Amino acid sequence: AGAARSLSRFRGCLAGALLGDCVGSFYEAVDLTSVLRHVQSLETEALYYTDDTAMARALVQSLLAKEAFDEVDMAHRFAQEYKKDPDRGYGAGVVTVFKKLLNPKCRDVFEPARAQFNGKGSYGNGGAMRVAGISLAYSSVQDVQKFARLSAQLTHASSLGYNGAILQALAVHLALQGESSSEHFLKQLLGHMEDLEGDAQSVLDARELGMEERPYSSRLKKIGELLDQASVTREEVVSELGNGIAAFESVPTAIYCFLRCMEPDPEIPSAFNSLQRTLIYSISLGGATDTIATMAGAIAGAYYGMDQVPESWQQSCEGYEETDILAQSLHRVFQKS
Numbered sequence: 001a002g003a004a005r006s007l008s009r010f011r012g013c014l015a016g017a018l019l020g021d022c023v024g025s026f027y028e029a030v031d032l033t034s035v036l037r038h039v040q041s042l043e044t045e046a047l048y049y050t051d052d053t054a055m056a057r058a059l060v061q062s063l064l065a066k067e068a069f070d071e072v073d074m075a076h077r078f079a080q081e082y083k084k085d086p087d088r089g090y091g092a093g094v095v096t097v098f099k100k101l102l103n104p105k106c107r108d109v110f111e112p113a114r115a116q117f118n119g120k121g122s123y124g125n126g127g128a129m130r131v132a133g134i135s136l137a138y139s140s141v142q143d144v145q146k147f148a149r150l151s152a153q154l155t156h157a158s159s160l161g162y163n164g165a166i167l168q169a170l171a172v173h174l175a176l177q178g179e180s181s182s183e184h185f186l187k188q189l190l191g192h193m194e195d196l197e198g199d200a201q202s203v204l205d206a207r208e209l210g211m212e213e214r215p216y217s218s219r220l221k222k223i224g225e226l227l228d229q230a231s232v233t234r235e236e237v238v239s240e241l242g243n244g245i246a247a248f249e250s251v252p253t254a255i256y257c258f259l260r261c262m263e264p265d266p267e268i269p270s271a272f273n274s275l276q277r278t279l280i281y282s283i284s285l286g287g288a289t290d291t292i293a294t295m296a297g298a299i300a301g302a303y304y305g306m307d308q309v310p311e312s313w314q315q316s317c318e319g320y321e322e323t324d325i326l327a328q329s330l331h332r333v334f335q336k337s
């Protein structure tokens with residue numbers, strides 16, 4: 001709500017991400033009718049957050065402590081946050097990275113991520129699940145891309161992983177700018193991803209995994225088709241975009257959820273506002289619901305602002321007040337209000 005990159009959008013962004021994580025986590029690894037029954041419960045801090053929020057908080061606290069990106073600080077905050085509470089539902093592979101980073105002999109904090117999965121790097125969505133803070137801290141598209149990539153590379157060295165983090169950060173960046181058509185929003189994202197996926201390293205990373213050339217671009221083109229298609233079913237969405245833990249099977253899906261739900265949906269009750277129905281729709285897709293909902297929620301919260309964050313939902317979430325203070329701090333320190 002209000003001006004581009006306003007305090008309301010900053011607070012709404014991080015609150016939306018927390019709601020998606022906490023509420024989404026109920027359904028991780030799902031039918032439209034019975035989701036609507038579950039949010040009835042939310043009509044305090046009983047919903048625990050997961051690794052999505054834990055790593056987002058460490059990322060933001062690194063940015064605030066150094067008033068800049070500092071790979072050693074952030075890498076060590078990721079590792080110490082894991083050491084402090086390892087039971088948040090971290091990916092099975094990424095824990096190896098944290099353990100390597102906990103060794104004081106580790107002098108290049110990017111190298112543990114590069115050894116993952118036979119030296120090809122992770123393409124999991126962990127780099128994207130946490131990246132919204134980057135777009136709160138950085139105004140420029142150039143800086144958003146630069147530090148979404150770097151923050152992700154601390155754990156996700158595959159371009160399939162960090163290009164999902166960039167896409168998700170670009171989406172939040174665009175949402176923080178305010179009102180747009182769904183087609184203009186999508187078109188801008190398509191342009192950026194077409195540019196990034198023209199890079200030789202990206203092409204090789206994708207051909208090695210047997211995927212199409214420009215996987216994110218192809219999925220963003222499918223979003224545009226889906227947005228023009230009649231009677232789109234959840235199975236159709238899952239089949240074309242995915243609902244899994246790969247970044248390329250969850251980040252475009254999160255974006256689709258946001259774009260679709262910019263308009264009312266007769267199949268979800270009018271009493272839910274735009275942020276609420278975006279989260280409800282995301283969870284109804286099943287699969288990796290907490291990360292898809294957390295990412296859709298970050299985009300929607302930045303676009304719709306704090307006035308659409310419902311207190312009853314927010315106050316069910318573990319850490320919601322700290323999440324809010326961190327949002328306000330980013331706005332003070334980086335948006336320099």
Ligand SMILES: Nc1ncnc2c1ncn2[C@@H]1O[C@H](COP(=O)(O)OP(=O)(O)OC[C@H]2O[C@H](O)[C@H](O)[C@@H]2O)[C@@H](O)[C@H]1O
Nearest residue numbers: 051089090091092093094117121122123124125126245291
């Ligand atoms: N190159 C690869 N080859 C094969 N499998 C892979 C590869 N990369 C990832 N995977 C699979 O992807 C998995 C995750 O990769 P990880 O890097 O451990 O962690 P994350 O931070 O991305 O978290 C992944 C999500 O899952 C949880 O719900 C979290 O909350 C996240 O939402 C691996 O275990 C592999 O099965």
Ligand SMILES: [Mg+2]
Nearest residue numbers: 050051052290
């Ligand atoms: Mg999680």
